[PDB]
Design a protein around this motif. Structure first.
Motif, PDB file in Angstrom:
ATOM      1  N   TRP A  12      -3.319  -0.145  16.319  1.00 13.86           N
ATOM      2  CA  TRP A  12      -4.373  -0.147  15.317  1.00 13.86           C
ATOM      3  C   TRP A  12      -5.258  -1.367  15.428  1.00 13.86           C
ATOM      4  CZ3 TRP A  12      -5.480   2.790  10.656  1.00 13.86           C
ATOM      5  CH2 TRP A  12      -4.843   4.046  10.660  1.00 13.86           C
ATOM      6  N   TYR A  42       0.930   4.363   1.939  1.00 16.09           N
ATOM      7  CA  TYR A  42       0.372   5.703   1.827  1.00 16.09           C
ATOM      8  C   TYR A  42       1.057   6.417   0.679  1.00 16.09           C
ATOM      9  CZ  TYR A  42      -1.528   5.030   6.478  1.00 16.09           C
ATOM     10  OH  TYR A  42      -2.194   4.556   7.581  1.00 16.09           O
ATOM     11  N   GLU A  71     -15.376   1.587  14.020  1.00 20.21           N
ATOM     12  CA  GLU A  71     -14.917   2.589  13.059  1.00 20.21           C
ATOM     13  C   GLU A  71     -15.967   3.686  12.863  1.00 20.21           C
ATOM     14  OE1 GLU A  71     -12.832   0.977   9.374  1.00 20.21           O
ATOM     15  OE2 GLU A  71     -14.001  -0.767  10.121  1.00 20.21           O
TER      16      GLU A  71
END
Ligand code: HEM
Ligand code: HEM
Ligand SMILES: CNCCc1cccc(OCc2ccc3ccc(N)nc3c2)c1
Ligand SMILES: CNCCc1cccc(OCc2ccc3ccc(N)nc3c2)c1
Ligand SMILES: C[C@H](O)[C@H](O)[C@H]1CNc2nc(N)[nH]c(=O)c2N1
Ligand SMILES: C[C@H](O)[C@H](O)[C@H]1CNc2nc(N)[nH]c(=O)c2N1
Ligand SMILES: [Zn+2]
Lengths: 404, 403
Positions: free
Chosen positions: A371, A399, A285
């Protein structure tokens, strides 16, 4: 044979069936005509059904389905919605719900840890000053001087009429992004907009590549107020390389604590618009995404020139060589600083173990392959060879639109 | 209705409208996405797919509604009405094969789609003739290292009889010999096919890179064994530009990736044997064929030769050894003057392809999980590209193994 998605591991030649997807009450973006799985972002009657479902989940988790307490809680909620239009979760329901939300998150590779989550109840919070205090306490507890601990702080739920609690920042710790008069950006281009919002709201801006943003905190029906984190609470890790001595001279650093603060936590129809949560980083990340993405710090070419690579041709694999050393530096520096981090191999291995746990526990595990597979060394990790079914279970992290 | 497709590196948005031309269902439903699964779980029909295809063809030569278009629809109509099926003219077949490649969602090589040599092998009556056509295919496609994409198309499936089949998954594959102690010598992906060749009377070797004979099946007959003339099979010895011990590993791979187990569907007709080849993208050889745990699995060996800390994951030894292997492949092909493309150049040209196809058709079917390379994914532009996956015809499809 069985009327459920057949799931295969191509490395091990092993088959499972996902029965859990049957419990999905929400439809994703795909249809038989086209798959949209790669896309990043694709009422008392309704509330009661959602609440009934969650209370059923809850009492099942404590093995009391059909019990008297189960049915009384059912009636307690139905009556409460019938008088107020909404209802409230008991503390233990909230702890269960927050964990189930994490457990349900198709895009999180760190879910083996799902049962170990400290839940802070902040549903009593009534101001932005108070939100700041809870957030600071969270950062302190979760950071724990480098020995990171998963945590979530839950602020008051959405109320009919009333305005939401919101944390404007996408994470509690973020670097400023300063747009230059020559089109470029100093710092993190991902955070240009929020930087500009901070400035308009009274923040005096710096001009470093690594200025920590202040928090913009919004209590109901009020303009957001600006809070600066005291530096001591924000653990940062200076990046160096185990063998390339010049790497430390690059002056790169990253913050210890990934603390996502812009997601909505949905539990039993109730919506927590502010419920920041944090874990620890996977090295890729920071090393691959935040530092090497072209639309982020974009330091790949910089590192490659220091490594004296041929950046004039794709076929030297200079991008790959540089990315590996950057990831190695992230790993080495975090270990050196004694700050919790996990590499993409260790993470993915632990995720396969999680898939086997959930296969036995629940008959499957919702997972978003694009992902879950790490952004470098994809096929070198076992998850690459694992077929996965993606679907939405509730409780869930969702979200939400930006507050402005 | 129409999907909003976004590139997250550049911020740009397209809308895929081509997906509306899909008439074949994929594995996803609103309840659950199955996009990461590798394989899938009469006259009215055939005629509609035939009309649709003929329409595409005459539209492609800019001759829709014309007289030749009309007469060709009536021929197909008359032939199906009388025989339950019909036949493609060679020109239609060439167009169909190119569209199938163009439509293949998992292919990163599709910038090349209009450059495809099509061999009509539909006048094949025996395994012996299939072998002749295949040898010619390989000779043409290999072209002394200057690789040229090609497809050879064998007789279509027919209602009455068995299919023409090539039993091998690729025309060139290395044997996998199952040793007594469970382990495998050679390519583990090919243990089954290697056993089949032996049962059918092939004298096996004992190497890691023994080129397999072809098993060719003419309809309703036992398959036959044919050994490829070794001079027809270009192979590349692997060495590393700076690590001199690398060549000592005796690693090699063949030049020609020639898939032979897939079905070509055009206008409702199905071609069960239709092997095609282009050229390798380096990560197929370096990353998947050599480093995959269930393939040659050479990662740890190479890591030890680089004197890496194999003890822990956090030293990224796997990542380091993989990069040097992919570099070895690129270097060795470039040194042997055999066409190859790295995953960066490939993905860059696929983005160009998406842009062309957006203007030409209003979209492009793409399988993200397959288009993004198996190492250094986010370092390529396709990673940041949202993609829409769906099925168009003509198409390549998987089909059962003929045994
Ligand atoms: C404990 C260590 C943890 C690790 C190693 C971890 C790992 C990750 C990683 C690597 C991603 C991919 C994100 C990206 O590339 O942008 C992710 C996504 C996600 N994680 Fe975890 N996570 C951890 C803890 C948590 C916790 C505590 C929660 C919530 C309680 C959580 C919830 C999520 C969610 C909801 C996503 C999806 C975010 C989105 O869809 O944008 N994770 N996680
Ligand atoms: C010209 C150079 C070409 C390159 C560099 C290329 C590249 C690739 C790559 C890297 C894959 C993924 C393969 C894997 O991981 O196993 C693929 C898949 C595929 N390619 Fe291409 N290709 C080329 C030519 C062709 C041609 C000529 C055809 C057909 C006429 C074709 C049709 C396909 C199909 C149908 C797939 C999906 C295979 C499957 O589903 O197993 N390609 N391609
Ligand atoms: C650009 N991503 C779009 C959604 C988004 C926006 C901002 C931040 C973000 O972070 C995802 C995320 C969430 C939770 C995490 C927990 C732990 C961890 N190591 N990474 C984690 C990463 C995700
Ligand atoms: C294991 N993948 C599914 C079925 C299968 C079986 C055997 C080989 C195979 O190769 C995929 C494939 C197909 C076409 C290609 C064209 C060019 C290229 N360089 N590689 C290509 C690779 C695919
Ligand atoms: C287009 C594509 O969906 C996008 O680049 C995705 C791919 N996979 C990802 N995977 C993770 N873990 N995080 C991400 O931000 C993304 N981005
Ligand atoms: C399970 C997963 O879908 C499988 O490993 C896929 C992933 N992406 C791939 N991509 C390519 N090009 N080739 C493959 O074989 C695969 N395998
Ligand atoms: Zn899908």
């Amino acid at each position: 044979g069985p009327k459920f998605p057949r799931v295969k591991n191509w490395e091990l030649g092993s088959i499972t069936y996902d029965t859990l997807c049957a419990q999905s009450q929400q439809d994703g973006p795909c249809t038989p005509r086209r798959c949209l799985g790669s896309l990043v972002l694709p009422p008392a009657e309704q509330l009661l059904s959602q609440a009934r479902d969650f209370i059923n989940q809850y009492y099942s988790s404590i093995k009391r389905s059909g019990s008297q307490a189960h049915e009384e809680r059912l009636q307690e909620v139905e009556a409460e919605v019938a008088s107020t239009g909404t209802y409230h979760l008991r503390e233990s329901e909230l702890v269960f719900g927050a964990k189930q939300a994490w457990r349900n998150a198709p895009r999180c590779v760190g879910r083996i840890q799902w049962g170990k989550l400290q839940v802070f109840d902040a549903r009593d919070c009534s101001s932005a000053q108070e939100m700041f205090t809870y957030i600071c306490n969270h950062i302190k507890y979760a950071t724990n001087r480098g020995n990171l601990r998963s945590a979530i702080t839950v602020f008051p739920q959405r109320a009919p009429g009333r305005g939401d609690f919101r944390i404007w920042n996408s994470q509690l710790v973020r670097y400023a992004g300063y747009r230059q008069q020559d089109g470029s950006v100093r710092g993190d281009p991902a955070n240009v907009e929020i930087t500009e919002l901070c400035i308009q709201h009274g923040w005096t801006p710096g001009n470093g590549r690594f200025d920590v943003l202040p928090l913009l905190l919004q209590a109901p029906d009020e303009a957001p107020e600006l809070f600066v984190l005291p530096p001591e609470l924000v653990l940062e890790v200076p990046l160096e390389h185990p063998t390339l001595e010049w790497f430390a001279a690059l002056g790169l650093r990253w913050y210890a604590l990934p603390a996502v603060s812009n997601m909505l936590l949905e539990i039993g129809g109730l919506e927590f618009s502010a419920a920041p949560f944090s874990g620890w980083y996977m090295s890729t990340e920071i090393g691959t995404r935040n530092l090497c993405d072209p639309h982020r710090y974009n330091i790949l070419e910089d590192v490659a020139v220091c490594m004296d690579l041929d950046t004039r041709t794709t076929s030297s694999l200079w991008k790959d060589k540089a990315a590996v050393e950057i990831n190695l530096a992230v790993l080495h520096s975090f270990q050196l600083a004694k700050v919790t981090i996990v590499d993409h191999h260790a993470a993915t291995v632990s995720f396969m173990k999680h898939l086997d746990n959930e296969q036995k526990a629940r008959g499957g595990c919702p997972a978003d392959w694009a992902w879950i597979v790490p952004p470098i060394s994809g096929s070198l990790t076992p998850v690459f060879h694992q077929e996965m079914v993606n679907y939405i279970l509730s409780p869930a992290f969702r979200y939400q639109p930006d507050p402005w």
